[PDB]
Amino acid sequence: SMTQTFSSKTEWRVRAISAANLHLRTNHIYVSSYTYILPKNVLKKFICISDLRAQIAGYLYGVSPPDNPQVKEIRCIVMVPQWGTHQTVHLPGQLPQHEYLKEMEPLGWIHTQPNESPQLSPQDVTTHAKIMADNPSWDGEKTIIITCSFTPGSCTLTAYKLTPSGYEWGRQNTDKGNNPKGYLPSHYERVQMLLSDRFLGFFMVPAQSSWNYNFMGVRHDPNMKYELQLANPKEFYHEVHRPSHFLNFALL
């Protein structure tokens, strides 16, 4: 007398409906009370192009104001081929390279995460330290980790520095879990971060494709090489980021 039938409820459909309301969080951005000044225009765009469950990341580039070398103005965010989960974001080993960024210095990276947390993530220390160990252009005293956590109806930002001991731990860490061994809160400090309207930042995106590989993670490996171009990134669920969903009606 039963005869009930399952009909799939693919969850990227539900999450894609949420991403279209992300723009409302850009009216409720909060910053936690060297110095780093984030321009609002690229931050708002970075929020909208993102996802509520899958983390996304972007590299930070900037330059100190003329006579004021103790503050770092963030002038550019670079989106590189990536995929993410709710705990990390898998970047390629190759750091951005472009003529435009040569006049600037690298200031670290900014990523989103689902829930706020009073502590910089352990796999976040591991990420930052492992980048520093492969790229001496990341100073440690000048590169930060700006977290963008999806608090209810909002967006709160926090900027962390790595410590010397946090660096030496993160390089050697292999446990990718959320409570690995030798993890200690003395691996990071907070740093001053300000959101400003006085200048605009700009984006650089990949040249031969886009940045979002979360719907095609197999064609993404840590050794992948990419060029860049002066242009703005596409939203998370844009067509070009999931062509299978469109082309797989040639079977239906």
Partner: protein
């Protein structure tokens, strides 16, 4: 007035549409009888009989004979056509012809067509394609195509073209210029005339045929009412008639239809009952009573079989089913049970039965069956149509397309059901009336049947209806009350209805209105308040009120119930133009927002009111959830929402899924037919709102809908001509499509791994549209950036894929790619598919300076076809902020007594007692010093008085000094000349002269003139020759006025001459004083520095100091369609007048000649609506009639009588004077002037309104922004220093132009040079004059210019990146090197040793006659030893000087038949090149033809350059030694002067000498001016029947006619020196003292006789000596050449004028 009730329109609606039955009983013909059967009832109606033939048929031989080709191969008009031919062909009367279907109405329509075709027959060629258009309105699309070929075949002998109207926008306007009869559907013609602002082609409509006009009763009926009311009302407001022809079925209310068509019922109404059917019809109706689901279904098949059995073998039976699916099925079900036994010939069927194969078909033929529907191949039912026509098919089961689109008759017709599924209603409904009549109308073949048999099977409840429809008893009602809001909005958007009064008047033209009068009970009205409102005035006002309120609630219109006024909106216009119901447009208005996902866009589309009847049926949630489950755009709403269903069908249609539900595929078709224009509405809304992200999404959705694919599909799929399947090949190789351009042919065959088609993919890879972009950033200020975008195509054109054009959108987006800072529509035509295109625009910039903008150019039609150029500003050099102005010091105003010269004071003290502050500050420096002075102040500052000061100073120093005054515009010059003629000539006894074209004249004006007024070009031609002319270097004062125009289009000439006067002053070392006046310049110091003005002598005043304070207001207007935008400015113009100057004079500038008349009338209608009628007339209607006795403009006098004037280039010279007079006197309060007149208006106003700031360019077919200089000049008219404490100005612009106007009106103006783009003709002049002798001279020369100074102050603007000293000698050198090589390549200069430049002969001719160096180059190629008077015109027309002769599609036609009348028919005519228009205008001039007044003003500019070009040729032919063509061009100069051909008679030069006069004198023995000059005195007054005043005119010409007897002698003739000198002396002596110039009344400028003296060998075609000669009294001229060897040669002399014909002397002489 006053609407008193808000109706519920939906209650008034006839719900059943054309199935509404107004008649409650239906009477049948006498033989009718009813049966009764098991489950169905049967009504039989017997065939009628013709009625006893009471006039005779018309032999085609008696039709008018211009009309007999339309009836080629025809005998005799049938009965109907014979009753109609006199009304159709011999009168213009509107007609309404009601006849049974196929009674012959279509030939009656040709007869009307043929009468209009006749209106443009001369014997000429034969028909004038250009004067008219004919509109045939047919209900069905299938009907249109048949009629296009049927009418085209019958009229192709008339050379006219009949064409269908494709659904396109801008490609379907091309086909209207070419066709005379346009066949279209009601809705297609409605869409086109809803825009009309194109400068329409619909003004040529002379005839409108409305076929099947009983469509009025259909849901589509209101389209017909909208069309007629618009036409008839347009007849009122233009007074050119349009003939209307209605053809309808024979149904009740036809007389009301005739009232609605304005048909005189006693002249144009013709009703032929169904007894005039071609073949009598035996009718059978079968009304099934079974309400059981599918026992009714097989009862139907039972009735079908029995009826089809009655006709087995005897007659073919066309069975009508109502879906392309039911054709095959019903046709086979019949054949299925006919297996019991059959009744037949057969292998002509079996032969083609699988010669041709096609599923089912002799599964559906055995017993001659067939189907016919729109899904089958063209030929797979072409002569399947015609297996039937050969009587070979026995049963044909078809749909209604065959009835409408193919003339296929059959003895028996069976309409199976009457039920059809209607997606618009989301429901099964009955067929439309047109379909039923059309199908049954196909019963009974023309010849072979004595009766057709029509069988209709339907539900028994519908019998009375179908009985009524087929027996003249279903009345034709109006369905428009529903569509009234939409229709009314269309008339508001057009400006046809501006208030509810207009709308009530408009409504009275509707068919609805007629029906409401005749039958008020049917239409909710009411016998007992009708008679209390007999015109239904209150009723109409109430309906219009209800509609207005609905339109106001949905934000389409702004309606206030007090005024009853309507106000168009952009949303309103979009709803009308995209044919979208207004409820939909409000939904878009509220849901559309820039933050929109593609998820939410798809949802917004699915909520359009066009889909308000769609539902999710239970038997539909099958696929609807299967598809929704995984569809690429998620759908938030549940399956139970019909919005989700529409969403799924749209995406399924794009993915090309094919569904299984029968209604769902039908619903999918309706959804996506609408999507195209609905989605384009959204695109236009969001694009014009600036929403960069949404604009990109919507335009994508348009293209996806159009091409049925997603972006993620390889864009090669779009190559329609593509049967490859080899991109799913490519698509599974996921790699960037942009990468295939890099690579060759074979590697593609390797990436996709199909070797054989590597080349074909490569071919289509580069057929795909691809543009490359480069950008030149040009900073204007620190806040406004000018951008030059160069588009370079990078693909191959191919009309098989691209057609004639490819459309692109250029999009300038900001940093975050979310605001469109600028956008424009770019069209790449196939003629220029291989050229770079230059685009310029302005964008705003701020000084923290954004990292970059972006420039996108995306295909309008091609998916995945876009190029984005990042425009970064990291290296943008901004200019420096402008310095503060010169402070205006609070000096007490200087009195005119400070001139200390009573004579000088006689020029001012009558008018004003004190000079203004600006004049008071500069006075001392100007009057009491010789310093070079710059005065920069707002226009209207009395800047010209300051120059008068310097002239007065000169007159004291020199008493005979020369002053050259330059102003940039010829209208300003002529106004300066009168005011300065009064002052310095009349009241000071100096000489004031105003230069013309003629250098010979102007040279003497420079000697005698104490002050010379000149435009730039006229001084350039003369100042070039300054080393030869003392008069040019002996100039005390040089005044350049309005100098800020160096930055405008004509700046470079003005910049060259000023620098020349600066350079001359250096060479002569006796300085020339320079005074420069200017509008407020931000970079004033650069101008002053360039002209040598000490900083204390540069007065840089900014706008704030204008002596009469200016109140500038800038109103922004949101509508982007300029015609609608103008409409939304109409009333705000009148409101500005009452707000800012309800009493004091107002000038309104409007963009075009046509607009002056319209706005003047508009202002008056609004004035009379204020019931302040004539509030602008301050004199009585009495004082005006002495003025109003010149009505050469009939409408200006109605305007003047109500207080308004208008001014444009078309009014007579003194017409403009009288409007100006009445204006400046105060009698006329308002004058509406065109934009072109803004430079020569002799009046001023308290308030200036600028109505829009763009004008249409006829040449480039695009709207151009007003130059900023013109706007400054218009605003300066709001300045009355004697009468007003203030000047006010309102600028109404497109909102996108507002910020620009505030920036460049309030702040002083920055001006740059554009001489770097104008180098050749001036470098050529300085190499001729030896100022430039080597490439270093060219560099030194550039540094005198204004271009130099600005290079260091704004390098990026001139394409510099550093102001280093070597950077710009590098730059200056490059400019020198490329200008000299071009000049050297074109053979005007020679370059020696990579360094030395010197003039060649061409260069001398070009510089001498002020002729562009490329004009003289084509002269040098084309001119040759043989070409004569004909080819000369051909090569002069091609001059660059005539490149910018305007071309309008209006006279794209008068010249088509002008080439018919010119003596010299022309090489390969193309007809929209200016060079052939100039060719024909020149030929039309020598033949004394009078053209348009527009073609007249066109010609007067052509002739203004002709003499220079003609003389350039004579100078070229002679130095090459060619005798015949040189003399030929010398007589062309006299030809173009007196307007003649050389074959004409010499006496055609005399005044009043006309056609017959010359024959009267050739008859007597006189053929010369000298033969007249003395025949016995009164023996001529009796020979010319002419007025004594006319005789006096003939005498003056004879006395100015040259009377020189030439003396020739040769020096020392005894000397044959075998190759030495041979001087020969010629002396010229006239008898008179030529008091006056050449008398040539048909030449625009005054000339003076120019003479050539030629030595040539007549036999050799060999010119030897040549010299020009101006002559009066004394003249001795010497000619010399080198002798030949032999002692036996004779030459012939030639005395040749360039003005008069018949004075050419000729002596022969052998000088050994």
């Amino acid at each position: 007035l006053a609407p008193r009730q808000v109706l519920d329109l939906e209650d008034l609606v006839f719900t059943q549409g054309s199935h509404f039955m107004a008649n409650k009983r239906c009477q049948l013909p006498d033989g009718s009888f009813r049966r009764q059967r098991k489950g169905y009832e049967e009504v039989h109606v017997p065939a009628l009989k013709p009625k006893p033939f009471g006039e005779q048929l018309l032999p085609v031989e008696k039709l008018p004979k211009y009309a007999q080709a339309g009836f080629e191969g025809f005998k005799t008009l049938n009965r109907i056509q014979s009753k109609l031919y006199r009304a159709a062909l011999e009168t213009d009367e509107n007609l309404l012809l009601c006849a049974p279907t196929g009674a012959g109405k279509t030939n009656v329509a040709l007869m009307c067509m043929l009468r209009e075709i006749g209106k443009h027959i001369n014997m000429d060629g034969t028909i004038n394609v250009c004067d008219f258009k004919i509109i045939y309105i047919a209900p069905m699309r299938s009907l249109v195509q048949e009629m296009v070929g049927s009418f085209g075949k019958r009229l192709a002998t008339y050379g006219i073209t009949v064409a269908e109207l494709t659904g396109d926008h801008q490609l379907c306007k091309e086909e209207i210029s070419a066709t005379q009869i346009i066949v279209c559907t009601p809705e297609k013609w409605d869409i086109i005339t809803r825009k009309g602002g194109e400068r329409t082609y619909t003004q040529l409509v002379r005839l409108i045929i409305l076929d099947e006009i009983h469509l009025l009763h259909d849901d589509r009926g209101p389209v017909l009412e909208a069309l007629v009311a618009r036409a008839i009302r347009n007849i009122e407001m233009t007074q050119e008639d349009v003939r209307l022809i209605g053809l309808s079925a024979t149904l009740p209310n036809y007389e009301d239809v005739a009232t609605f068509l304005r048909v005189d019922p006693a002249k144009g109404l013709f009703y032929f009952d169904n007894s005039f059917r071609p073949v009598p019809l035996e009718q059978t109706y079968v009304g099934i009573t079974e309400k059981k689901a599918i026992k009714r279904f097989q009862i139907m098949n039972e009735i079908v079989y029995e009826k089809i059995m009655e006709h087995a073998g005897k007659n073919q039976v066309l069975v009508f089913v109502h879906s392309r699916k039911e054709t095959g099925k019903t046709a086979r079900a019949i054949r299925d049970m006919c297996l019991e036994k059959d009744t037949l010939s057969t292998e002509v069927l079996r032969t083609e039965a699988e010669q041709c194969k096609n599923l089912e078909l002799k599964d559906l033929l055995p017993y001659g069956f067939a189907i016919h529907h729109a899904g089958m191949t063209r030929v797979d039912r072409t002569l399947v149509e015609d297996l039937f026509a050969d009587k070979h098919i026995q049963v044909l089961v078809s749909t209604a397309t065959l009835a409408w689109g193919v003339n296929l008759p059959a003895h028996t017709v069976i309409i199976k059901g009457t039920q059809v599924y209607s997606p618009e209603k989301g429901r099964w409904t009955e067929l439309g009336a047109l379909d039923i009549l059309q199908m049954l109308g196909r019963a009974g073949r023309p010849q072979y049947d004595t009766k057709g048999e029509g069988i209709l099977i339907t539900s028994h409840g519908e019998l009375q209806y179908y009985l009524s429809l087929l027996n003249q008893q279903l009345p034709i009602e109006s369905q428009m009350v529903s569509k009234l809001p939409d229709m009314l909005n269309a008339e508001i958007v057009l400006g046809n209805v501006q208030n509810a009064k207009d709308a009530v008047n408009w409504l009275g033209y509707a068919y609805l209105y007629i029906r409401m009068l005749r039958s008020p009970t049917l239409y909710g009205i009411s016998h007992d308040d009708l008679k209390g409102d007999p015109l239904l005035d209150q009723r109409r006002l109430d309906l219009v009120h209800t509609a207005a309120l609905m339109l106001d609630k949905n934000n389409l219109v702004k309606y206030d119930k007090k005024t009853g006024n309507f106000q168009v909106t952009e949303l309103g216009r979009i709803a009308s133009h995209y044919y979208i119901t207004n409820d939909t447009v409000q939904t878009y208005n509220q849901l559309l927002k820039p933050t929109l996902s593609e998820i939410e866009l798809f949802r917004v589309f699915s909520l359009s009111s066009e889909f308000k009847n769609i539902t999710v049926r239970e038997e539909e949630k099958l696929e609807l959830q299967k598809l929704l489950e995984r569809v690429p755009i998620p759908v938030k709403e549940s399956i139970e929402e019909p919005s989700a269903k529409i969403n799924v069908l749209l995406q399924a249609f794009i993915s090309q899924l094919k569904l299984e539900g029968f209604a769902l595929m039908a619903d999918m078709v309706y959804v996506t037919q609408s999507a195209g224009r609905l989605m384009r509405a959204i695109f236009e809304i969001v694009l014009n709102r600036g929403w960069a992200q949404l604009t990109d999404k919507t335009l994508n959705l348009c293209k996806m809908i159009d091409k049925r694919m997603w972006q993620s599909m390889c864009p090669l799929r779009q190559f329609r001509k593509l049967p490859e399947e080899v991109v799913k090949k490519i698509e599974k190789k996921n790699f960037p499509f942009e990468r295939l351009y890099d690579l060759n042919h074979n590697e593609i065959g390797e990436l996709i791994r199909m070797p054989k088609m590597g080349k074909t993919i490569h071919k289509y890879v580069h057929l795909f549209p691809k543009l490359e972009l480069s950008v030149h950033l040009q900073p204007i200020t620190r806040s406004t950036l000018k951008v030059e975008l160069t588009i370079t195509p990078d693909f191959q054109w191919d009309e098989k894929v691209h057609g004639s054009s490819e459309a692109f959108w250029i999009l300038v987006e900001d940093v975050d790619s979310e605001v469109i800072l600028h956008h424009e529509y770019f069209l790449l035509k196939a003629k220029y598919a291989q050229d770079e295109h230059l685009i310029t625009f302005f964008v705003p910039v701020f000084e923290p300076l954004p990292p970059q903008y972006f420039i996108r150019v995306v295909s309008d039609r091609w998916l995945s076809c876009e190029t984005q150029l990042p425009v970064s500003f990291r290296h943008l050099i901004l200019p420096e902020k402008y310095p503060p102005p010169t402070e205006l010091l609070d000096l007490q105003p200087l009195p005119v007594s400070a001139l200390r010269n009573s004579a000088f004071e006689s020029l001012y003290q009558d008018k004003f007692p004190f000079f203004n502050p600006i004049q008071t500050q500069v006075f001392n420096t100007v009057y009491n010093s010789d310093d070079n002075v710059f005065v920069g102040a707002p226009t209207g500052s009395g800047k010209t008085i300051c120059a008068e000061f310097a002239i007065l100073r000169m007159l004291l120093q020199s008493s005979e000094g020369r002053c050259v005054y330059i102003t940039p515009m010829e209208a300003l010059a002529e106004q300066v000349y009168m005011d300065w003629y009064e002052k310095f000539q009349d009241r000071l006894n100096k000489k004031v002269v105003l230069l013309t074209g003629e250098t010979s004249t102007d040279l003497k004006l420079l000697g005698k003139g104490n002050i010379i007024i000149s435009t730039p070009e006229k001084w350039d031609i003369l100042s070039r020759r300054w080393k030869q002319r003392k008069n040019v270097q002996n100039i005390n004062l040089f005044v350049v006025d309005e100098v800020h125009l160096i930055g405008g289009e004509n700046g470079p000439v003005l910049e060259v001459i000023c620098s020349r006067m600066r350079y001359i002053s250096s060479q002569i070392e006796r300085p020339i004083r320079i005074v420069a006046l200017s509008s407020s310049l931000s970079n004033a110091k650069d101008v002053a520095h360039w002209l040598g003005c000490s900083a204390t002598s540069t007065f840089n005043f900014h706008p704030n100091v204008r002596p009469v304070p200016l109140e500038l207001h800038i109103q922004g207007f949101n509508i982007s369609h300029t015609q609608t935008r103008l409409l939304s400015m109409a009333k705000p113009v009148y409101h500005a007048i009452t707000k800012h100057s309800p009493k004091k004079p107002v000038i309104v500038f409007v963009p075009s000649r046509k607009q002056t008349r319209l706005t003047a009338i508009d202002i008056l209608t609004t004035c009379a609506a204020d019931i302040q009628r004539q509030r602008f007339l301050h004199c009585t209607e009495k004082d005006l009639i002495p003025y109003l006795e010149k009505l050469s403009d009939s409408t200006l006098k109605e305007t003047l009588l109500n207080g308004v004037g208008y001014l444009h280039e078309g009014l007579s010279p003194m017409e403009r004077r009288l409007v100006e007079q009445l204006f400046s006197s105060g009698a006329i309060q308002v004058v509406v002037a065109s934009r072109s007149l803004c430079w020569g208006m002799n009046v001023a106003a308290h308030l200036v309104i600028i109505m829009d700031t763009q004008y249409y360019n006829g040449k480039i077919h695009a709207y151009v922004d007003y130059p900023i200089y013109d706007v400054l000049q218009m605003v300066g008219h709001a300045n009355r220093p004697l009468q007003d404490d203030e000047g006010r100005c309102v600028i109404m612009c497109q909102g996108s132009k507002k910020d620009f106007f505030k920036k460049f009106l309030y702040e002083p103006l920055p001006v740059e040079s554009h001489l770097d783009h104008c180098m050749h003709d001036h470098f050529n002049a300085e190499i001729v004059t030896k100022t430039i002798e080597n490439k270093q001279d060219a560099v030194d020369y550039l540094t005198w210019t204004f271009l130099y100074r600005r290079m260091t102050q704004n390098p990026n603007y001139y394409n510099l990146q550093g102001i280093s000293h070597r950077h710009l000698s590098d730059h200056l050198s490059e400019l020198v090197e490329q200008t000299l090589s071009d000049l050297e390549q074109s053979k005007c200069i020679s370059i020696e040793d990579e360094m030395d430049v010197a003039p060649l002969n061409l260069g001398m001719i070009a510089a001498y006659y002020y002729i562009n160096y490329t004009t003289i180059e084509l002269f040098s190629m084309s001119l040759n030893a043989k070409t004569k008077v004909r080819g000369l015109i051909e090569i002069i027309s091609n001059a660059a000087e005539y490149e910018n002769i305007p071309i309008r599609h209006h006279e794209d036609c008068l010249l088509r038949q002008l080439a018919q009348k010119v003596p010299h028919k022309l090489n390969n005519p193309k007809f929209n090149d200016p060079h052939v228009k100039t060719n024909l205008l020149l030929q039309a001039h020598l033949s004394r033809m009078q053209l348009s007044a527009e073609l007249q003003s066109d010609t007067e500019e052509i002739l203004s350059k002709a003499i220079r070009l003609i003389q350039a040729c004579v100078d070229v032919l002679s130095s090459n030694g060619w005798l015949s063509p040189a003399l030929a061009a010398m007589e062309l100069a006299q030809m173009v002067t007196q307007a003649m051909w050389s074959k004409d008679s010499y006496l055609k030069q005399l005044p009043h000498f006309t056609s017959e006069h010359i024959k009267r004198c050739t008859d007597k023995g006189v053929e010369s001016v000298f033969d007249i000059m003395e025949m016995e005195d009164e023996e001529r007054n009796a020979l010319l029947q002419l007025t004594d005043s006319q005789i006096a005119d003939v005498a003056r010409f004879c006395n100015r006619y040259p009377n020189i007897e030439l003396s020739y002698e040769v020096v020392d003739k005894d000397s044959i020196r075998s190759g030495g000198p041979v001087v020969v002396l010629v002396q010229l002596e006239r008898e008179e003292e030529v008091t006056g110039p050449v008398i040539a009344p048909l030449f625009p400028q005054k000339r003076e006789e120019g003479w050539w003296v030629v030595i040539g060998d007549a036999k050799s075609n060999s010119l030897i000596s040549i010299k020009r000669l101006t002559l009066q009294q004394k003249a001795k001229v010497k000619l010399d050449f080198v002798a030949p060897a032999t002692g036996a040669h004779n030459y012939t002399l030639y005395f040749m004028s360039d003005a008069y014909m018949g004075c050419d002397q000729e002596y022969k002489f052998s000088v050994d």
